[PDB]
Amino acid sequence: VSESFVAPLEKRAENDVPLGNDVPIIDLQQDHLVVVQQITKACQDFGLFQVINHGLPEKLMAETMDVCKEFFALPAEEKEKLQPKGEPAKFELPLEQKAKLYVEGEQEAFLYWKDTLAHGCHPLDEELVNSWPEKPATYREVVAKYSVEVRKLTMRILDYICEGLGLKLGYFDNELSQIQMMLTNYYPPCPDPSSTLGSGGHYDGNLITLLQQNLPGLQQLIAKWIAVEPIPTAFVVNLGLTLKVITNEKFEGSIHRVVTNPTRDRVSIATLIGPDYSCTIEPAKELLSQDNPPLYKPYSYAEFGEIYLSDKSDYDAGVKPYKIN
Ligand SMILES: CN1[C@H]2C[C@H](OC(=O)[C@H](CO)c3ccccc3)C[C@@H]1[C@@H](O)C2
Ligand SMILES: [Fe+2]
Ligand SMILES: [Sr+2]
Ligand SMILES: [Sr+2]
Structure with missing residues (x-):
């Protein structure tokens, strides 16, 4: 691989990371109080759990993964239309809601082995959707439905969290959840997985993240890394650094990374x-x-x-300046 993608020695992933057998898998069609209690325990102890029977259509999950894979199969001449001034955008402020392709890394400066399509999803209006990818033809109609459904499920989970914390229902149904960034992450096969990272270890800086995956590569820090089992019909819920702060560390944030694969894309x-x-x-x-x-x-x-x-x-460098007591 290009030296651009070589991670510092200490950040490189070991080859045999064990399955996280203790990652909570929470059935949202259990009794209301059982769901509240199980989500609460997972937020307190882990900060990462999966949700099943979550009410979001399995067919829509499959159609969204299909159109996202179809997008990354597009030729260079189409992908260039999402590269401002001929190159991928950077994860820096201002983070615009129009669709762009992004590069990401750390400044021992190195790049993540990853292409990311990102755009805003909320509120859904003609102007925002008109700034989404033109190809594939069905991207806008499918991802508009997906974004509304994923938001609906996220707000249900946030209200379960409110009941667990003893906050009023709708505590997060305001400016605290106003931004909805959909990041479609493409990990092409990597000739040297021992030297590279799809995504360096991080908290998500935001409130809460729902992650859909079909294939392995997601890992969580519990200095022990574990593998998060891909369940194609589940969402991985990652609690963000913002929720860690708002709960005064009663909840854990999810520290996670993505490893590369030598043989297949993800x-x-x-x-x-x-x-x-x-x-x-x-x-x-x-x-x-x-x-x-x-x-x-x-x-x-x-x-x-x-x-x-x-x-x-450090993982919490973002909040270090604001720490007290
Ligand atoms: C690996 N990267 C991390 C940083 C960046 O995250 C973002 O870009 C989000 C998008 O909401 C953000 C959160 C909080 C403040 C600024 C940006 C892009 C991706 C994410 O998976 C998390
Ligand atoms: Fe993340
Ligand atoms: Sr280019
Ligand atoms: Sr346009």
Whole structure:
């Protein structure tokens, strides 16, 4: 592989990462209180769980994976239409909601073995959808339906979380969930998987992420890495750094990475829901007391975003400046 993609020695993945047998798989068609309790335990102990029988149509999940794979099968001349000034966009502010192809890495500067299609999904209007990919022909109609359904499921999970925390229902149904970035991640086969990463270890900076996958490669840090079993009809729920802060660390954030494969490609669909850049983030005042003092001072999501996207010296470098007590 090009030296551009060689990860620092300490960040390279070992070849035999064990299956995470303790990753919670939560059936959302259990009794209401059982679902609340199981989600609450998973958020407190792990910060990563899968949801099944989640009410999002399996046919739509399959049709969305199909059109996402079809997009990444498009020729160069079509993909160039999503490369501003002839190259992929960077994950930096301002993060625009129009569709672009993105490159990502860390500055021992190296690049992730990954192509990402990203666009906003909320609110859905003619202007936003007109800024989505023109090809494949069915991308817009399928992904419009998918984005509405994934948001519906995310808001159900956030209200289960509200009941678990003792927050009012709809606590996150506001500016805290206003941004919905859909990241379609393409991992082509890699000649040297021992030296590269599809995605370096990270928290998602946002509130909550739902991830759809068909093939292995996703791993979680529990200094022990575990493999997250692909269930094609499930969503992986990753709690973000923003929810870790708002819950005053009552909930864990998911630290995860993606490893490369020498033989086959992989497509994942990540729906990243979180605050508008104008938001002020702080521990929920409703949960604070002399026994539970705030561990973070209030901060600008925009200010956090700039640090989160640039400083990868530590997983929580984004929130380090705002730590108190
Ligand atoms: C591996 N990368 C991490 C950083 C970046 O994330 C983003 O771009 C999100 C998109 O909501 C973001 C969150 C919080 C602040 C700024 C950006 C792109 C991807 C994600 O999987 C997480
Ligand atoms: Fe992520
Ligand atoms: Sr180009
Ligand atoms: Sr257009």
